[PDB]
Amino acid sequence: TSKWFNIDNKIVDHRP
Amino acid sequence: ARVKRGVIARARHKKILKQAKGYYGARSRVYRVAFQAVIKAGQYAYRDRRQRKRQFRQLWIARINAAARQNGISYSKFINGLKKASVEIDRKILADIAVFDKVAFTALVEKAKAALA
Amino acid sequence: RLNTLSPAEGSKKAGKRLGRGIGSGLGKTGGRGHKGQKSRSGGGVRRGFEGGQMPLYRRLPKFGFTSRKAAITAEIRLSDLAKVEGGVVDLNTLKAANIIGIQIEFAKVILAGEVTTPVTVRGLRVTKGARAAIEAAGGKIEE
Amino acid sequence: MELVLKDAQSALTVSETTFGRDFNEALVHQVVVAYAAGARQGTRAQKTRAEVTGSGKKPWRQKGTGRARSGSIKSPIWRSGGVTFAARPQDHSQKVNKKMYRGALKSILSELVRQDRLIVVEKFSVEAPKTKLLAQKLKDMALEDVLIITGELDENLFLAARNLHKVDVRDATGIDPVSLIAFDKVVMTADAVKQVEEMLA
Amino acid sequence: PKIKTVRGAAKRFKKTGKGGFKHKHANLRHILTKKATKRKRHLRPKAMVSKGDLGLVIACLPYA
RNA sequence: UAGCGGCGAGCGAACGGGGAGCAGCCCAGAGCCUGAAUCAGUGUGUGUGUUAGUGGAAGCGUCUGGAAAGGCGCGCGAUACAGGGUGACAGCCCCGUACACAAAAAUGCACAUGCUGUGAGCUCGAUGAGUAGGGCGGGACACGUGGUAUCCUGUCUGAAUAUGGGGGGACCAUCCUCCAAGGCUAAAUACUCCUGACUGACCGAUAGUGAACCAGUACCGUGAGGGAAAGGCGAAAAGAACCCCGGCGAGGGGAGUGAAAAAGAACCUGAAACCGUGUACGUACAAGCAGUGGGAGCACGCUUAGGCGUGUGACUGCGUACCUUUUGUAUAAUGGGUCAGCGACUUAUAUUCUGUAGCAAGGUUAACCGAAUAGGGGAGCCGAAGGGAAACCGAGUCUUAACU
Ligand SMILES: N[C@@H](Cc1c[nH]c2ccccc12)C(=O)O
Ligand SMILES: [Mg+2]
Ligand SMILES: [Mg+2]
Ligand SMILES: [Mg+2]
Ligand SMILES: [Mg+2]
Ligand SMILES: [Mg+2]
Ligand SMILES: [Mg+2]
Ligand SMILES: [Mg+2]
Ligand SMILES: [Mg+2]
Ligand SMILES: [Mg+2]
Ligand SMILES: [Mg+2]
Ligand SMILES: [Mg+2]
Ligand SMILES: [Mg+2]
Ligand SMILES: [Mg+2]
Ligand SMILES: [Mg+2]
Ligand SMILES: [Mg+2]
Ligand SMILES: [Mg+2]
Ligand SMILES: [Mg+2]
Ligand SMILES: [Mg+2]
Ligand SMILES: [Mg+2]
Ligand SMILES: [Mg+2]
Ligand SMILES: [Mg+2]
Ligand SMILES: [Mg+2]
Ligand SMILES: [Mg+2]
Ligand SMILES: [Mg+2]
Ligand SMILES: [Mg+2]
Secondary structure: OOOHHHHOHHHHHOOO | OOOOOOHHHHHHHHHHHHHOOOOOOHHHHOHHHHHHHHHHHHHHHHHHHHHHHHHHHHHHHHHHHHHHHHOOOOHHHHHHHHHHOOOOOOOOOHHHHHHHOHHHHHHHHHHHHHHHO | OOOOOOOOOOOOOOOOOOOOOOOOOOOOOOOOOOOOOOOOOOOOOOOOOEOEOOOHHHHOOOOOOOOOOHHHEEEOOOOOOOOOOOOEEEOOOOOOOOOOOOOOOEEEOOOOOOOOOOOEEEOOOOOHHHHHHHHOOOOEEEO | OOOOOOOOOOOOOOOHHHHOOOOOHHHHHHHHHHHHOOOOOOOOOOOOOOOOOOOOOOOOOOOOOOOOOOOOOOOOOOOOOOOOOOOOOOOOOOOOOHHHHHHHHHHHHHHHOOOOOEOOEOOOOOOOOOHHHHHHHHHHHOOOOEOOEOOOOOHHHHHOOOOOOOEOOEOOOOOOHHHHHHOOEEOOEHHHHHHHHHHOO | OOOOOOHHHHOOOOOOOOOOOOEOOOOOOOOOOOOOHHHHHHOOOOEOOOOOOHHHHHHHOOOO
């Protein structure tokens, strides 16, 4: 499946 | 008609690895890596066939020069002499004689000096 | 001798293969170029299409009207009739000599040159030049 | 064009146009090739992705797994199941114009004489349905490999030779292009010659 | 399967003798009263499809 | 093609012609004569196929070899040289093959009849109404309502009846042609779960069926359902008695079998990535795509030396991988851990051009017949005439009253 950090929004969204 | 393939394949591959013999690590083991190593070796060669003629000429010119200076005359003047020395033409390599026959050289230097007088 | 036959030279052009390596001349991209609609499986655009611009066969007006009577009128060459078989070139008859086609109901004779054997043409129409050529070869043109 | 009738030296007299004409190699080569094609049957396998056995479920998510895209388990790129351009049974029959076929036979006959590989005879037949007989006739006639085109064809001449491998026997209509070239010598009865004479016009 | 003629084009071109195509001019179907008689006059007789469009038309009328 | 068509995309006939196969009959009814044609269901018979079967020709010598079917020699059968097998490739070793034969029983198919059911035949009659047509709404016809014939009917209607009625693509006349509103009907046509036999310029274990294998299995899923991997010792098991180390082990070494054991069952061939042992040479003052040009030394062969082959490569000139994508990439932009196997411009039908071949003002046939790649079949298609929307005219024609 996918690692938790990839699914998680705060770490992943990082630069909008 | 289905084509087996793969007997001709390792033919192509081994054809390359053989050319890679001697190279370090993957360059001699791993085709994908070897096929590159094999090409660039080729590339340098094609280049360095032309370089070879450059490298040696300046090798010759370098030692022509000391011997000339050794007989008290720069390379500049010394080739100009031989040029002007009533025509006359003679390879810069063949000035080999500078290493193996130093009287013959000095002898060539004089002949050159004379034309410059 | 069954392995000594060979075809006429230049009767069997090999034919592009493409997609097989640098040397081939048609490797990688396969003569299709780089990107765009025209590359890509099933690419291309339909006939007549010229970008979204109004196409020629639509800028220009229609002007038809199909005779339908014309479809059943044949034209006859002088070169025929000699081949009619029976010296009478008739409403059909030509039809039987396979030079008209059943459905036909009308026929002109047309100066398409060369008539020799005297022949009488019957129930057809015939041009000024054709009549003259027929008659001048001993022919007869009764309606 | 006269032909040495071999046994009862008699001469047969044949059409110069159908027995004395120049050898048109290309033109024959088209017909012999054509005949070899059409020998073919279709009969052929291979399942496009549309016909390999599996469901049409996407093997795994478009995005997310660290994996290549993947769409159908029957994809030619994948292992079991594929074949991009799977063949179908197909028909290799070529045309060959009427006038080209005839044109080839003529170039072929008119070359068999020129190598005297064609020996024409008044009558040819074996006395009983026994291979050994025919084997002897050929022996006596100095022959192993032979086509022997008979006039009307008889029972015994056929049953002999059925088992001799390099020798076949055909009636007048049975003449095909490969055979004329196939055998080392074509025999042909003078009776058959006249048949062929006309068949080719 | 046989190619299908691009039916619309069939109704706007006719193959000529040497293999040309001839068509009716545009610009002559309405809003006429304001156009010179000279202009309208020149737009009556049919005209050959140009060299540049030949490619198109032929691809539309394989059975022309 | 004619037509249909946001006259877009597309859809696409018929007339007539050549072929395959051809077949025609009942009811709407009563009288006489009566079970008379016929059809099915059925019993029997007969023939013919089927479901077990029978006979079936002819080879030996020697050489190599573990083994002959192979080579060489000399015979022999062949209506049998299809094919498989046998210690390597067999017409004559085996099983077959050609060919000739065989059915106690049960059956398919034809006829022939028995039994049942059924009606035949002649005379005189009868001739398909909630139908045709119409209105409204849809649907079918190549045809999108269009000038739209024709067909079907959900809805509301509704005739004529042989001096009658339908159709001939709006519609009318004339002409011509057919008889709706009841049915039956064989062949040419379609298909292959399955039976038999035969064939392939079809695959050969990542191929070919998912499945060459005890596979729809193991496995996954609540379930529908998904769905693998995995073939080869040898000619023959002759599949290793017995001895030794070891834990009455694992594993191993001898012995023995065999042509081979390096064919030992984790078994034909045994590649590559990858990991070791051995030897030669280099390497612990040296900086980078690791090679390339030069190049000593060392080890090894040479040669008779002779700055020669092979291996290594101090030192040294030059030198930022590949693909892709880009105006441009060492790029710190993409893709690749490595190897092996697989993995991407095909096929069919139309059309046009080039080459080439045939024939030539002609060329060629399609289906189909077939003595089946032949021969027949010219229905037809292309061309020899063009111009015009068209009638029509024709080496001209169109334009216009007419063309310099
Ligand atoms: N257990 C996780 C949290 C988590 C679980 N699943 C996730 C999916 C998406 C994001 C976060 C999570 C943690 O270490 O915090
Ligand atoms: Mg230079
Ligand atoms: Mg690209
Ligand atoms: Mg672009
Ligand atoms: Mg492009
Ligand atoms: Mg005709
Ligand atoms: Mg699906
Ligand atoms: Mg990955
Ligand atoms: Mg497959
Ligand atoms: Mg034919
Ligand atoms: Mg107008
Ligand atoms: Mg038997
Ligand atoms: Mg036998
Ligand atoms: Mg009626
Ligand atoms: Mg019926
Ligand atoms: Mg498999
Ligand atoms: Mg294998
Ligand atoms: Mg092994
Ligand atoms: Mg050091
Ligand atoms: Mg370093
Ligand atoms: Mg430095
Ligand atoms: Mg950029
Ligand atoms: Mg670019
Ligand atoms: Mg660069
Ligand atoms: Mg880096
Ligand atoms: Mg990168």
